[PDB]
Each structure stands twice: as structure tokens, then as C-alpha cells.
Design a protein around this ligand. Structure first.
Ligand code: LHG
Ligand code: LHG
Ligand code: LHG
Ligand code: LHG
Ligand code: LHG
Ligand code: LHG
Ligand code: LHG
Ligand code: LHG
Ligand code: LHG
Ligand code: LHG
Ligand code: LHG
Ligand code: LHG
Ligand code: LHG
Lengths: 66, 66, 66, 66, 66, 66, 66, 66, 66, 66, 66, 66, 66, 66, 66, 66, 66, 66, 66
């Protein structure tokens, strides 16, 4: 291959792909955010956000390939 | 593994997962919020919010994996 | 433990759990609210609210664990 | 040919064209960015950005020829 | 399955379906409400409400599937 | 196809279409809402809402195609 | 033609025109939004919004040409 | 003519005039924006924006001469 | 046809037209209401209401076309 | 014509004019509403409402031109 | 004339004047709104609104000159 | 005169004075805005706004001298 | 005079003073409102409102000076 | 005097003091507002507002000194 | 004295102290603001603001020494 | 004393304490309000409000110390 | 002591502690607010607010230590 | 020790730790803020904020170690 | 070893690692910042920031090795 930077996928996928700790933390953050904002406001949009983010990331990562 | 940040789960799960003190505090806050807002308004939605949040967090955390 | 915030339960439970002064004050507020609103309107719902709040908080706090 | 620098396309295309690791990383970054910014703000524009970037790069690279 | 949120039925059905404690409590509330409002007003509609709610929930839950 | 985002239907339909857990939960919520609001107010509109929502979603989803 | 960017219509129409997955998802979102907001508020405007959006997009896309 | 840059109109008009792919894409973007923002907020201004932009561009381009 | 919502008649007529279970239930409710209110008051208007409602619905549905 | 939005009448008339499914559904709703509210209250105004709405829509649509 | 923007009246009048499709749609919307809100509430103000809007627009457009 | 910019009044008055197409368009916009917002809300302030704007502009332009 | 806005009285008095078309329309509206609300409710207050408004405006305008 | 801005009172008092056209217009607006809101709602507070504003401005301006 | 800027009090006090034209204008502005906002909203807070500002400035200036 | 704002009591007590013109005006307003609302509704609560407000202010001001 | 800012308590306590003029003014404001809002609305909550604020401040200041 | 900056704790703890004048002032500020905002709005959240801040700081400082 | 700068870790770790006075001061700063910003705005994000920073630093320092 001529892609001089090709080897970087091992750690980029490791750290930033769907299964990485960083991605999992972002999803976790929504569960917590949903809980506290709903508690505070009772606005149902805060609960739907969880399903939305999980769906978004799932599609995004599939398309990105990571 | 190639996930350079993998070790962070020990404290992220500790502090922000289902069993953490932060999550428990958010649930507690609803019990109190339910009580005072119902006292103030007598609007039953304030009481249902407790069951809703507990259910939401339970599902969310299971899905998040924490 | 890995829960970096674990120590906070001593005062959170103290101040916001079932036996705290804050919770007791909310219950007291209903007794007073019940009395004055019933006096004003004679609508029996104002009297039932006391039993409802006491029951709600009792269940909520048990579930929350505080 | 008289293009003294012609041979450079092998690595430029390898590293910076549509299929390179660099380009893939930029797309991945949007998936992550979308996720975290939506989590933070709930502003839907953050989710649309993914489809926009993928579309943009696809067109751009086709036109550029890489 | 592709329903990313599928696992949530275990607790949603548990807590909010026909046999849950929440639903049973709502029905109980009508028995009490019927009793006190009839006592107060002698308007027979308060007694019929019990049969109506029980019938409604039975049909609703069957249709909802919970 | 030229629709760069086409693959997303597998999970969007799974999670948000007519048969998904999210949609079923919204319908369930009406059964419960109908029950409690009718109990509270005896206003028949709360009972009709169930048939209305079920009908609405059925038509909407058919038209949306999910 | 002199439109240097002309080729972009293949994917723009694919991803953002009337028949694309993105557009279909927006319509689906209204069915769900209609359902939950009507459930919550019983305000009929939430149901009419579905017919309105479908009509709007149909006209808009025809005029846009996508 | 003495306008040293005169020849540029062939591609400027091609790419940036009324009939170009760029202009069409901007109009399309409003149809989509209108749809999603109305879905989110139900604020009618989002629907009127389509007619406004189409009208604006039509006048603007006529005056500009492209 | 240009009526984007045309397909909805299959279930609207099914659920809300003259022969639907909802309509039949409303008529049944009058038989019961007539019986109990006449029992309570001996006011003949309660008995005539049955013939009136049946007649009303019959005409109304014919005119509505369902 | 200079009305840039002229083509929209095909679907607006289809979906929202006198003969559309939406309009027919609104009329049907009155037949049902009349029936149930009269059953509940015996207030004759509920029966007259049907003739009133049919008359209103007939005049309104004629004037609107749809 | 010195009004650099004068030519815009051809489409502004076409799209936004009294006879345009946009204006007709707004009037139609009242017929529908009147019908459904009267059905829901039986408040006569909803019926008068039609005559009011038609009168308002007629005067307004005459004064505006479109 | 010493006003180096004096000649600009020919087009400023043409385009931005009382009789210009821009000013007429702003007034037209109120007729439309009044109509749609009144339709939506039935708040009479939306109708008075037309007379207010016409009056305001008339006074303003007289004072400005354009 | 130093009142920079003094000239505005010609049209303010014309349009909004006692003899203006706007004021006359408000009075007319009461005659109609009185008629329809009395027809609907037979509550005499609706008839007295006419004399009250006429008296109010007469005094108000005299005091205002318009 | 050392008040560098002292001369401004000639026009400030002219335009914004008790006797100015601006102040008179605000008072007039209440007469009209009172009339229309009372017509609409029959809530007597709308009539008292006139006496209140006149009294308020009279006191305010005396104190302000304009 | 060693205060190199001491002489500035003659005009600062003149222009910005309690008795200056600037301060008087700010107070006047409240009388007008109170009047128009109360006219618009009937919210009594707009009337109290006058007494509040006068009191505030009086105390503030005394403390400032100007 | 170290209370930098201490001097403000002279005017705060003057304007807002028990004997001030503002407080007297609020009490007067109740006499008038009582009169007109009783005239309108014959609901005795409007008359008791006078004794209640006078009593409230008397106690409040004593406690406040003004 | 090592608290470099320690001396600030003399004036902070003076101006912002329980006995300061600022705190007394806030309490006074409630007496007035209670009076006027009760006069306006007859909602008893406005009267209870006085006892609530006095109690709150008393506890708060004790805990704060000022 | 190798911490070249170690000596700074004497004044950092003095000025910014739990017992410092700065921290005490922040807590005091909430008592005052609670009082005035509750007075203004009657929104109970303003009162709870005191207990929340005291609890937060107590936990935070313990964890920080100051 | 060939790392000519190796000895620097004694003071770098001392001053800038997890246990240093500098790091502790940054954490302390958040406790204070959280307190004051929450006091000012009541936005819960200010309280969560403490747990977030503590968690971040803990992970970061572990990974850095200091
Ligand atoms: C430090 C303690 C944290 C747990 C406290 C929970 C016990 C008390 C909570 C409820 C009392 C509030 C009044 C009830 C309900 C109420 O009326 O107030 C809710 C109110 C927000 O209401 P909004 O302004 O959205 O409401 C608008 C309308 O609803 C007006 O009524 O104030 C809050 O934000 C309370 C939440 C504070 C944050 C609570 C959760 C804290 C989560 C983070 C835990 C800390 C992690 C970091 C630790 C260092
Ligand atoms: C500092 C004292 C806190 C406890 C006070 C309780 C004793 C008195 C309570 C009831 C008297 C009110 C009149 C009764 C009933 C009544 O008519 O008023 C209820 C009224 C709210 O009513 P809404 O405006 O929702 O009602 C709308 C309609 O119902 C109109 O009637 O005012 C309140 O919010 C009272 C609650 C104040 C907050 C009370 C709970 C405080 C919880 C926090 C405890 C403090 C924690 C922080 C400590 C620093
Ligand atoms: C925690 C306990 C929940 C179950 C309590 C049921 C037993 C007692 C219920 C009836 C006594 C009320 C007086 C009877 C009838 C009565 O006169 O009061 C009904 C009254 C509401 O009446 P409205 O104000 O609509 O009435 C207007 C006119 O009818 C005036 O008469 O108050 C309520 O909302 C009671 C409902 C409280 C909520 C009850 C259902 C709770 C559902 C949620 C269950 C909890 C899930 C969360 C758990 C943490
Ligand atoms: C996690 C569980 C979600 C499903 C829960 C459904 C079972 C219980 C629902 C009804 C109990 C509420 C009391 C009944 C009725 C009632 O009185 O409360 C309705 C009330 C809203 O009422 P408003 O404040 O609009 O009412 C104003 C007036 O009507 C006052 O009466 O509270 C809600 O928003 C309840 C909806 C919570 C959201 C329910 C739907 C959730 C959809 C999303 C599903 C989750 C997707 C994400 C999963 C992670
Ligand atoms: C990835 C999935 C995208 C499609 C999801 C649609 C199914 C579920 C949607 C509705 C559930 C929300 C709750 C209903 C309704 C509801 O209550 O929430 C609406 C709420 C916004 O409401 P506002 O805050 O404006 O409301 C203010 C007041 O109305 C408060 O009630 O949250 C949203 O923005 C939802 C929209 C998320 C975005 C949905 C459209 C996504 C378009 C882009 C598609 C993706 C393209 C990129 C793909 C990578
Ligand atoms: C789920 C079952 C629905 C059908 C039940 C019909 C059989 C029993 C009906 C009559 C027994 C009531 C006592 C008789 C007569 C009586 O005295 O009570 C009538 C009473 C209302 O009376 P008002 O309060 O207007 O009366 C004021 C004065 O007349 C006082 O006497 O209560 C009702 O609203 C009953 C109607 C419940 C709704 C019945 C119709 C339901 C239509 C919707 C069908 C469901 C569609 C959704 C399905 C999920
Ligand atoms: C694309 C189609 C546009 C014409 C549609 C008209 C036919 C149906 C309209 C009425 C059905 C709504 C339910 C009736 C009445 C009803 O209950 O809903 C009215 C409701 C707004 O009500 P609010 O929320 O102000 O009401 C508060 C309280 O009244 C609650 O009841 O929703 C709307 O905004 C409807 C208006 C949508 C916009 C309609 C006008 C569109 C003008 C622009 C035309 C398009 C120009 C751009 C074209 C690309
Ligand atoms: C190119 C055409 C310009 C004239 C168009 C006028 C006909 C249609 C106007 C009203 C339809 C909007 C919906 C009605 C009312 C409505 O609901 O929308 C008003 C809405 C703004 O509302 P806000 O967001 O401030 O409202 C906040 C709340 O009121 C939410 O309801 O959108 C606009 O800004 C419309 C104005 C567009 C600009 C109109 C004036 C253009 C002036 C410049 C003229 C052009 C000079 C340059 C020419 C090249
Ligand atoms: C363009 C025409 C303006 C004049 C129309 C007057 C003739 C018809 C008026 C009464 C018919 C309404 C039904 C009667 C009575 C009735 O039942 O409806 C009154 C109803 C408002 O009632 P609320 O909703 O406050 O009532 C609550 C309860 O009373 C429910 O019954 O609707 C209105 O706001 C009508 C007023 C429209 C505005 C009328 C005055 C217009 C003033 C501005 C004049 C225009 C200046 C700008 C010109 C461009
Ligand atoms: C240029 C003319 C200015 C004077 C016009 C006064 C005559 C007509 C006024 C009342 C008709 C409005 C409908 C009545 C009452 C009504 O229902 O509408 C009041 C309404 C505001 O109501 P809100 O939206 O606060 O009401 C919320 C609820 O009350 C809903 O009912 O609209 C206005 O803001 C009207 C005020 C326009 C501004 C009037 C004062 C102008 C002061 C400045 C004078 C100009 C100085 C600059 C000159 C260049
Ligand atoms: C040159 C004249 C300066 C004095 C003018 C005072 C008389 C009229 C003032 C009130 C009419 C405004 C409408 C009332 C109230 C109103 O509704 O408008 C208030 C509005 C600001 O409101 P916001 O946008 O903050 O309001 C947000 C919400 O309240 C929306 O309602 O506009 C202003 O800023 C007016 C202030 C202009 C500045 C006035 C003070 C000038 C101080 C400086 C004096 C000059 C020193 C330099 C001299 C060269
Ligand atoms: C400048 C004069 C201030 C004192 C005026 C008092 C004499 C007349 C008062 C009562 C006549 C109102 C009709 C009676 C009763 C009535 O029906 O109207 C009460 C009504 C408010 O009622 P709501 O809209 O809350 O009522 C909802 C339902 O009760 C509908 O009936 O209007 C007011 O807000 C009147 C209060 C104006 C403010 C009065 C107090 C002013 C306090 C400040 C004093 C000024 C300090 C600043 C000076 C520059
Ligand atoms: C020098 C004194 C410092 C302590 C003063 C505390 C006593 C009074 C505090 C509250 C009165 C404010 C009005 C209450 C509440 C209120 O309504 O105002 C809060 C307001 C900020 O509100 P926002 O603009 O975020 O609010 C947006 C909306 O809430 C609008 O309501 O103003 C402030 O920032 C006050 C804080 C000043 C800073 C106070 C803390 C000082 C910490 C530093 C201590 C000094 C260290 C250096 C010493 C040299």
C-alpha cells in the first residue's frame, strides 16, 4: 500500500471505534443526563435522547467503518 | 488491546454506573422532588415520575453496560 | 472501591434521606396545606393528599435506599 | 510527460484520498462529535452533520480525483 | 433483531403492565374514590366508575400487549 | 443506490417503527394514562384517547412506511 | 455544461431527496412525536402535524426538484 | 472589451447562478430544514421559510443576472 | 388521487364508523344509563334517550359516510 | 403565472379540502362526540352540533375554494 | 425609476398577495381549524373566526396593495 | 453643496422610502402574519398589528423624509 | 415646539381616536357579541355590556383627547 | 453649569414628558385596549386599567419633573 | 492634594450625579416604560418599578456622593 | 457600624413601610376591589379580604420592622 | 491565620448578614408583595410566603454564620 | 519532598478551603439569593438551593482535601 | 540509560503529578467554581463538573504515569 499512515487504524479503532471505552462513556453519559434532566424538568425529550444517541452511534460507526 | 484508554472503566463504572453514589443521588432527588411538587400542586404526574426514572435508568444502564 | 465520590453518602443521607429534617419539613408542609386548602374549599382531596404523600415518600425512600 | 512531480500521486492518493486512513479518521471523528455534542445540547444539527460530511467528502473526492 | 432497545420490555412489562403494582394501585384508587365520592354526593356515577375502569384497563392492556 | 445513508433503515425500523419496543411503550403509556386520568376526573375523553392513539399510530406508521 | 459541481446531484438526491432514508426518518419521527405528545397533552394539534409535514415535504421536494 | 476577467462568467454562472447544482442544493436544504424544525417545534415559521427562500433567490438571481 | 392521507379510511371506518365496536359500546351505554337513571328518578326522559341516540347516530353516520 | 408555489394546490386540496379524508374524519368525530356527550348529559346542544358543523364546513370550504 | 428592487413585485404579488396559493391555504386552514375546535369545545368563537379572518385579509391586502 | 454623498438619495429614496418595493413588502408581510397568527392563536393582537405597522411606517417615513 | 414627534397626531387621531374606523369596529363587535352570547346563554350581562362599552369609550376618548 | 448635556431637556421634555405626543399615544392605547379586551372577556379589570394608567402617569411625570 | 485627576469632579458630578440631565432622563424613561408595559400586560410589577428606581437612585447617589 | 448600606433605611422606611403612601394605596385598592367584586359576584369572600389584608400588613410590617 | 482575605467579614457581615439593611429590605419586600398579590388574586399562598421567607432566612443565616 | 510548590498550601487552604472567608461568603450569598428569588417568584427551587450548595461544598471540600 | 534528561522526573512528578500541590489546587478550584456558579445560575452542570474533573484527572494521571 501507499498509505503511509495506514498502521494508525490499530489504535484509532481501539480507542475511538464503536466498542471503545470512549464511545461507551459517551453513551453512559446520556443515561445519566437523561435521568437528571428528566428529574429536573419532566420533559420527555430527555428520555428519548437515549434511544436516539444509541441509534445514531450505531449507524454512524457502521458507516465510518469503526 | 489497542484501546489506549481502556483502564478508565474502573473509575467510570465506579462513579457513574448504576450502583454509584452519583446515580443513587439522582434517584433520591426524584423522591424528594416528587414529594414536594405533589405537595405543592397535587398533580399526579409528579408521583409517576419516580417509577419512570427508576425504570429509565435501569434500562439505560443495562444498555450502556455500566 | 473505585467510586471516587462514595464518601458523599454520609451527608446526602443525613440531609436528604427519609429521616432528615428536609424530608420531615416537606411532610409537615402537607399537613398545613391540607388544613388550609380544605378550610378554603372543602374539597376532600386536600385531606387525602396527606396519606398519599406519606405513603409515596415511604415507598420512594425505601426504593432509593435512603 | 513533463510533469516533474508526477510520481507523487502514489502516496498522495494513498494517504490523502477518499480511502485513506486519514480521511476515514476524519469521518469517524464526526460520528463521535455528533454523539457527544448531541448528548450535551440535544441540538439536532449535530446529528445531521454526519450525513453532511459523508456527502461532502464523497463529492469532493470525486471531483478532486482521489 | 435490530431493535436496539428490545431488552427494555422485561421491566416495562414488570412495572407498567396489567399485573404490575402500579396498575393495581390505580384500580385500588378507584375503589376508594368511588366510596368517598358516593358517600359525599350520592351520585351513582361514582360507583359505575369502578366497573368502567376495570373494563377499560383490561381491554387497553390486552391491546397494548402488556 | 446513491443514498449514502441507506443502511440506517435496519435499526431505525427496528427501534422506531410500528413494532418496536419504543412504540409499544408509548401505546402502553396511554392505557395507564387513560386509567389514572379517568379515575381522577371521570372525563370520558381520557378513555377515548386510547382508541385515538392506536388509530393514529397505525395510520402514521403505514404512511411513514415503518 | 459549465457547472463544475454538477456531478454532486447523484448523491445529494440519493441522500437528501424525497425518497431518501434521511427524509423518511424525519417523517417517521413525526409519527412518533405525534403519538407521544398527544398521549401527554391530548392536544389535537399534535395529530394534525403528521398530515402537515407529509404535505409540506411533498410540496417542498417537488419544488426543489429532488 | 477591456474586462480582462470577462471569460469567468461561463463557470461562475454555471456553478453559482440560479440553475446551478449549488443553488438547487441550498433550496433543498430548506425543505429538509423546514420539515425537521417544524417536526421538533411546531412553529409555523419553519414552513414559511421555504416559500421565502425560493422567492428571495428568484428575485436575487434575476437582479444579479445569473 | 392527491389525498396523501386517503388510506386512513380503512381503520377509521373500522374503528369509528356505525358498525364499530366503539359505536356499539356508546349505544349500549345508553341502555344501561336509561335503566339506572329511570330506576333512580322515574323521569321518563331517560327512557326516550335510547330511541333518540339510536336515531341520531343512524342519521349522523349516514351523513358522515361511515 | 408568477406564483412560485402554485403547484401545491394539488395536494393541499386533496388532503385538506371538503372531500378529503381529513375533513371527513372531523365530521365523523362530531357524530361520535354528539352521541357520547348526549348519552352522558342529555343536553340537546350536543345533537345540534352535528348539523352546525356540517353546515359550517360546507360554507367555509365553498368560500375558501377547496 | 430609482427603486433598484422594483422588479420583485412580480413574484411577491404572485406568491404572497390575496390570490396566491399561500394566502388561500391560510384561509383554508381556518375552515379546518374552526371545524375541529368547535367539534372539540363547542365554543362559538371558533366559527366566527372564519368570517373574521376572511374579512381581515380582504382589508389588509387591499391596503397593502397586493 | 459640500455633502460629498448627496447624490445617493436618488436610489436610497427609491429603494427604501415609503413607496418602495421593500417597504411595501414589509407591510404585506404583516397582513400575512396577522392572518396566520390569528388563525393559530385567536389572539386579537395579531390583527391590530396591521393598523399599528401601517401607522408607524407612515409617521416614521414622514419624519425621516423619505 | 420641541416635540420631535408632534406631527404623528394627524394619523393617530385619524386611525385610533373616537371617530375612527377601528374604534367603530370595536363597538360593532360588541353588538354582535352581545347578540350571540345572549342567544346562547340568556345571561343579561351580555346585553348590558353594550351600554358599558359605549360609555367607557366615550369617557376614555374624551380624557385621552382623541 | 457643569452639566455638559444640560441642553437635551428641551427635546426630551418635548417628546417624552407628560404633554408629548408619545405619552398621549400611550394613554390612548389604553382606551382602545380597555374597550377591546372588555368586549372580548367582560373582565372589569380592563376598564379600571384606564383610570390606573392615567393616575400612574400623572404621578410619575410629576415626580420625574417632565 | 496628590490626586492628579481631582478636577474632573466638576463635570462628572454635573453630568452624571443625581441632579444631572442624564439621571433625570433615566427616571423619566421608567415612567414611560411603566405606562406602556402596564398598558400591554396589566402586570402590576411595571408600576412598582417606578418607586423602586427612584428609591434606588436616591440611595445610590447618596452613597456614591454625587 | 460596618453596614455600608445602612443609610438607606431613611427612604426605604419612608416609601415602603407601614405608613407610606405606597402601602396606603395598596390597602385602598382592596376597598375598591372588594366593592366591585362583591357588586359583580355577591361572593362574601371579597368583603372579608379587606379585614384580611389590613391584618396581614399590620403583622407583616411589625415583624419586618418598618 | 493564613486566610489572606479574613478581614472582609467585618463588612460582609455588616452589609449582607441577618441584621443588615439589605436583608431587612428583602423581608420588607415580601410584606408588600404579599399584600399586593393577595389583593390582586386572593390566593392565600401569597400570605404564607411571608412566614416562609422569614423562616428561611432565619435558618439560612444561622447556618451561614452571618 | 520534590514538590517545589508545596509551601503554597498554607495560604491556599487558608483562603480557599472550607473554612475560609471566601467560601463562607459564597454560602451566605445563597441565603440571600434564595430569599430574594423566592420573594420574587415563589418558586420553591430557590429555597432548596441552600441545602444543595451547603451539601455540595461539604462533599467537594472533603474530597479536595481543603 | 541514554535519556540525558531522565533525572527531571523527580521534580516533575513532585510538582505536577497527581499528588502535587498544583493538581490539588486545580481540583479545589472546581469545588469553589461549582459552588459559585450553581449559586448564580442554578444550572446543575456546575455541580457535576466536580465529579467529572476528579474522574478525568484520576484517569489522566494514571495513563500519564504521574
Ligand atoms: C449534593 C446533593 C446532590 C443530591 C441532592 C438530592 C437531594 C435533594 C434533591 C431535590 C431537592 C430539590 C427540590 C426538589 C425538586 C425541585 O423543585 O427542584 C428542581 C429544580 C429545577 O427545576 P426547573 O427550574 O427545571 O423547573 C422549572 C419548573 O419546574 C418550575 O417549577 O432545581 C433543581 O435543579 C434541583 C436539582 C438539583 C440537583 C439535584 C441532583 C443532583 C445530581 C448530582 C448529584 C451530585 C453529583 C456531584 C456531587 C458533588
Ligand atoms: C423554611 C420552612 C420550610 C418548611 C415550611 C413548611 C411549613 C409551612 C408550609 C405550608 C404553608 C404554605 C401554605 C400551604 C399550602 C399552600 O396553599 O401553598 C402552596 C403554594 C404553591 O401552590 P401553587 O402555586 O402550586 O398552587 C396553584 C394553585 O393550587 C392555587 O391554589 O405555595 C408553596 O409553594 C408552598 C410551599 C413552600 C415550600 C414548602 C416546602 C418547603 C420544602 C423545603 C424545606 C426547606 C429546605 C430548605 C431549608 C432552608
Ligand atoms: C402511593 C399510593 C398510590 C396509590 C394510592 C391509592 C389509594 C388511595 C387513592 C385514592 C385516595 C384519594 C381520594 C379519592 C378520590 C378523590 O377524591 O381524589 C381525587 C383527586 C383528584 O381529583 P380532581 O382534583 O381531578 O377533582 C376535581 C373534582 O372532582 C373535585 O371533586 O385527587 C387525586 O388526584 C387522587 C389521586 C392521587 C393519585 C392516586 C393514584 C396514584 C397512581 C400512581 C400510583 C403510584 C405510582 C408511583 C408509586 C411511587
Ligand atoms: C421507561 C418507561 C417508558 C414507558 C413508561 C410507560 C408506562 C407508564 C407511563 C404513564 C405513567 C404516567 C402517568 C400517566 C399519565 C400522566 O398523568 O402523566 C402525563 C404527564 C405529562 O402531562 P402534562 O404535564 O402534559 O399534563 C398537563 C396536564 O395534563 C396536567 O394534568 O407526565 C408524562 O409526561 C408522562 C409520560 C412520561 C413518558 C411516557 C412515555 C415514554 C415514551 C418513551 C419510552 C422510552 C423510550 C426510551 C427508553 C429508554
Ligand atoms: C438516528 C435516528 C433518527 C430518526 C429517529 C426518529 C425516531 C424517533 C424520533 C422521535 C422520538 C423523539 C421524541 C418525539 C418528540 C419529542 O418529544 O421530542 C422532540 C424534542 C425537541 O423538542 P423541543 O425541545 O423543540 O420542544 C420544546 C417543547 O416542545 C417541549 O415539549 O427532541 C428532538 O429534537 C427529537 C428529534 C431528534 C431528531 C429526530 C429527527 C432526526 C432527523 C435526522 C435523521 C438522522 C440523519 C442522520 C443519521 C445519522
Ligand atoms: C370500557 C367500557 C366502555 C363501554 C361501557 C358501557 C357500559 C356501561 C356504561 C354506562 C354505565 C354508567 C352509568 C350509567 C349512566 C350514568 O349515570 O353515568 C353517566 C356519568 C356521566 O354523567 P354526568 O356526570 O354528565 O351527569 C351529571 C348528572 O347527570 C348527574 O346525574 O358517567 C359517565 O360519564 C358514564 C360514561 C362512561 C363512558 C361510557 C361510554 C364509553 C364510550 C367509550 C367506549 C370506550 C372506547 C375506548 C375503549 C378502550
Ligand atoms: C402544507 C399545508 C399548509 C396548509 C395546511 C392547511 C390545512 C390544514 C390546516 C389546519 C389543520 C391544523 C389543525 C387545525 C387547528 C389546530 O388545532 O391547530 C392549530 C395549532 C396551533 O395552535 P396553538 O398551539 O397556537 O394553540 C394553543 C391552543 O390553542 C391549544 O389548543 O397548530 C398549528 O399551528 C396549525 C397550523 C399549521 C400551519 C397551517 C397554516 C400553514 C400556512 C402556510 C402554508 C404553507 C406555505 C408554505 C408551503 C410550503
Ligand atoms: C422575498 C419576500 C419578502 C416578502 C415576503 C412577505 C410575504 C410573506 C411574509 C410572511 C410569511 C411569514 C409567516 C408570517 C408570520 C410568521 O409567523 O413568521 C414570522 C417569523 C419570525 O418570528 P419570530 O421567530 O420572531 O417569532 C417568535 C415567536 O413569535 C414564535 O411564534 O419569521 C419571519 O421572520 C418572517 C419574516 C421573513 C421576512 C419577511 C419580511 C421580508 C422583509 C424584506 C423584504 C425583502 C427585501 C429583500 C428582497 C430581496
Ligand atoms: C376585521 C373585522 C374586525 C371587526 C369585526 C367585528 C364584527 C364581528 C365581531 C364579533 C364576532 C365575534 C363573535 C362575537 C363574540 C364572541 O363570542 O367571540 C369573542 C371571542 C373571544 O372570547 P374569549 O375567548 O375571551 O372568551 C372566553 C369565553 O368567553 C368563552 O365564551 O373571540 C374574539 O376574540 C372575537 C373578537 C375578534 C376581534 C373583534 C374586534 C376586532 C378589533 C380590531 C378591528 C380590526 C382592526 C384591524 C383591521 C385590519
Ligand atoms: C403608531 C401608533 C402608536 C399608538 C397606537 C395606539 C392606538 C392603538 C393601540 C391599541 C391597539 C392594540 C390592541 C389593544 C390591546 C391589545 O389587545 O394588544 C396588546 C398587545 C400586547 O399584549 P400582550 O401580548 O402583552 O398580551 C398577552 C395577553 O394579554 C394576550 O391577550 O399588543 C400590543 O403590544 C399593543 C401595543 C402596541 C403599542 C401601543 C403603544 C405604542 C406606544 C408607542 C407610541 C409610538 C411612539 C413611536 C411613534 C413612531
Ligand atoms: C435621548 C432620550 C433618552 C431618554 C429617553 C427616555 C424617554 C423614553 C424612554 C422609554 C421609551 C422606551 C419604551 C419604554 C420601555 C420599553 O418597552 O423599552 C425597553 C427596551 C429594552 O427592553 P429589553 O429588550 O430589555 O426587554 C426585554 C423584554 O422586556 C421584552 O419586553 O428598550 C430600551 O432599551 C429602552 C431604553 C432606551 C434608553 C432609555 C434610557 C436612555 C438613558 C440614556 C439617556 C441618554 C444619555 C445620552 C444622551 C445623548
Ligand atoms: C396609581 C394608583 C395606584 C393605587 C390605585 C388604587 C385605587 C384603585 C385600585 C383598584 C381598582 C382596580 C379594580 C379593582 C379590583 C379588580 O378587579 O382588579 C384586579 C385586577 C387583577 O386581577 P387578576 O387579573 O389577578 O384577576 C383574575 C381574576 O380575579 C379575574 O377576575 O387588576 C389589578 O391588578 C388591579 C391592581 C392594579 C394595581 C393596584 C395596586 C397598585 C399598587 C401600587 C401603588 C402604586 C405604587 C407606584 C406609584 C407610582
Ligand atoms: C464582596 C461581597 C461578596 C459576598 C457578597 C454576598 C452577599 C450578597 C450576595 C447576593 C446578592 C445578590 C443578589 C442575590 C441573587 C441574585 O439575584 O443575583 C445573582 C446574579 C447572577 O444571576 P444570573 O445573571 O446568572 O441570573 C440569570 C437569571 O437568573 C436572571 O434572574 O448576580 C450575581 O452574580 C450575584 C453574585 C455576585 C457574587 C456573589 C458571590 C461573591 C463570591 C466571591 C466572594 C468575594 C471573593 C473576593 C472578595 C474580594
Amino acid at each position: 500500500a501507499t498509505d503511509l499512515m495506514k498502521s494508525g487504524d490499530a489504535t484509532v479503532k481501539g480507542t475511538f471505534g464503536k466498542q471503545s471505552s470512549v464511545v461507551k462513556w459517551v453513551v453512559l453519559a446520556e443515561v445519566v443526563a437523561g435521568g437528571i434532566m428528566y428529574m429536573m424538568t419532566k420533559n420527555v425529550k430527555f428520555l428519548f435522547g437515549f434511544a436516539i444517541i444509541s441509534t445514531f452511534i450505531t449507524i454512524g460507526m457502521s458507516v465510518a467503518g469503526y
